[PDB]
Structures are given as structure tokens and as C-alpha cells.
Write a protein that binds this ligand. Sequence first.
Ligand SMILES: O=C(NCc1cccc2c1OCCO2)c1ccc(-c2ccncc2)cc1
Lengths: 18, 334
Amino acid sequence: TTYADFIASGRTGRRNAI
Amino acid sequence: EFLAKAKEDFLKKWENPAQNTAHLDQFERIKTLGTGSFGRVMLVKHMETGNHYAMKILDKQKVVKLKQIEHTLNEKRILQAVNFPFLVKLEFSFKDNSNLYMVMEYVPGGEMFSHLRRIGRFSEPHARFYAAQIVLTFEYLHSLDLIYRDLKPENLLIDQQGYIQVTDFGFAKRVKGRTWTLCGTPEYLAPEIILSKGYNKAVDWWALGVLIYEMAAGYPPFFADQPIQIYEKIVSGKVRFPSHFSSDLKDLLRNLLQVDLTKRFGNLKNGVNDIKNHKWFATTDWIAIYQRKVEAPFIPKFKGPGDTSNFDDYEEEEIRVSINEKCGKEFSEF
Ligand SMILES: O=C(NCc1cccc2c1OCCO2)c1ccc(-c2ccncc2)cc1
């Protein structure tokens, strides 16, 4: 699922600005 | 409107900013609530009042090295001038040889981020409750010719009355026309920001679309392990929605996340009304939400004045103030 794919990504934490 | 009386007030303070409203020696340093490229945020206790505050410490050199001199001046200028229920309250501001300081009333509830991740996703009534707060805040900010450009769960704090308090005005700016800065968080960047075009407040309305999706879905509408891949999806004009998302939600979001910013909600002839008068916002009492009279779906667990349980732990480092002034000319107005 997309929820599973999100949770396994390195983009689950606090995202900083560019 | 009440909005006209609000601009009258903002303009008074914007044209004559408050400076040097305190000193570090007046604050008792307790704990680090957060970190960042050019400083940290600390839980401080103001000894004269016994009040608890969040103190944003900015290293002047680290701000200069990162081409952030103007952005910082915009941040303080706007924060000392604004007054809205869903904004962070900046009580004091000051600078010393080494840093810049912004002291704001402590929101012990923490970031919406923490709760959204732990809970997983909010029910559309719960999501709609917060969206309405942002919809009103943007209406307020935008009316004052201010572009926030930093919307994400990490910047929305939950008070004990269970309401939003928007932080990080580091990208906030007073623009009457077009702006071109390449700034924001990858997942929340509007297609005009990625495609290096001159943009307006339509970027704030797109950001909201992303927030509403992430709040309701539990994940953003565009994510990938690498930003280049995230951008490719945003500029593609394709969105997929979960099976539980309502028809009114899906339509709002498809209008909000409109790559054609000349057909995007909040950026049309009726502006903010196309949002406030949407089918998803039919159960929203825009006046009751502003007055905080609406029952908050979730109130954070309060362990006392000075509790930091909703904030993560960071190595409690040294606040060093050099015997020599650094970057004086650059931070003159602060
Ligand atoms: O502006 C903030 N943080 C951003 C930030 C701070 C320092 C350096 C940074 C940075 O961003 C990227 C550049 O490096 C901020 C966040 C939270 C609170 C707060 C308010 C009330 N209660 C608890 C906490 C106050 C300020």
C-alpha cells in the first residue's frame, strides 16, 4: 500500500527546508 | 471588515518595530525543544513573571553563511507586528555580539507532526478543524500583503485549548507583487516554485492542499526518497486519493492542488471565498473557529508548566557569546 511505502521511506521524519 | 482594523494595527508596528525588549540574563535556560541549520529553540523561564517561553537562538554568522540575512529581518519584523489567534506570540526580541533571539509564548503541546505520525491520520472532521484555522490565518496574512511560504505539520503547534499556533516565519515576507526565492520544504513546494517562476500567495493555497491531504491520508500527495523525484510528481499534475477520502475532499484538493495557478482555488476572482464556501467546508462555522468556541477534537496531555514531553531530546549544548560583536551592520534593524 501507499501508507506502507511512505512508512518505509526516508521521508517519515521532520523534513527540513531546501 | 475586522481585517481593515487589523491592517491598521499591523501597519503601525511594521512601520515602527519593537527592538531590544529583553536580555538573556532575564531568562533561565531549561531544555532544547528543537534544532536547525543556524540555531536552536530552547525552553526558557522568564524569572520576573515566572512565565514559560520558547526562545529561538540564531547564530548571525550561520545566518550570513547561508544567505539568510534578509529572511531573518523579514521574520522578526513580521512576527513583532502581527496579531491573530492562530499565530505564535512573540513577547520579546534582542541580539548580542553572537546571536539573535526571539522569545515567544511556550506551546507545550508540540508539533501537529508528532501527533499526525503517532495517530497515523485524522478523520476529515478533525482535519477540517485545523484547515479552517490555516484558511483564516492565510486570509489574515494575505490581507496584510504577507506570503508565509513555510506551511507543514512541523510548523503547526497545538495549544492546550487544542488549537493551532503557526511558527517559523523565517520565509514570511511582505510582497505586494511577485517574488522569486527558491525556498520551502520539497513535499510542499508549489509547481511555480520548482519551475523557478515569479510566484504569489497561490503557493500558500497549494501548500494547504498538501497539508489537508497529509492530515486526512496520513502521508503527503507526493513523496519519493529524493527531492528531484518529488518535484517530477508535483509538476506532473497528477494526484491519487485514498478510498476513504470523501467526494467533497477529493474535489477541494483537486482545485487546491491545481498546477495551473490561473484555475487554483484561493487565487481566483472570489479568492478565499471559493475555499470557505466549498462543500467540504459546509459544516464550518468560520466565526466560531476564530473565537475558539468550536470544540477541539483532541487536547494534548499536559504535565505542568514547563513540560517538554511533546518535544524530542537534543544534546544540551553550550550558549556561547563572543567578547567581539559579529555581523553588526548586517543585523542593524533587528
Ligand atoms: O521558528 C522555529 N524553528 C525554526 C528554526 C529554529 C532555529 C534554527 C533554524 C530553524 O529553522 C531552520 C533554520 O534553522 C520555531 C519552532 C518552534 C517554536 C516554538 C514555539 C512555541 N512553543 C514551542 C516551540 C519556536 C520557533
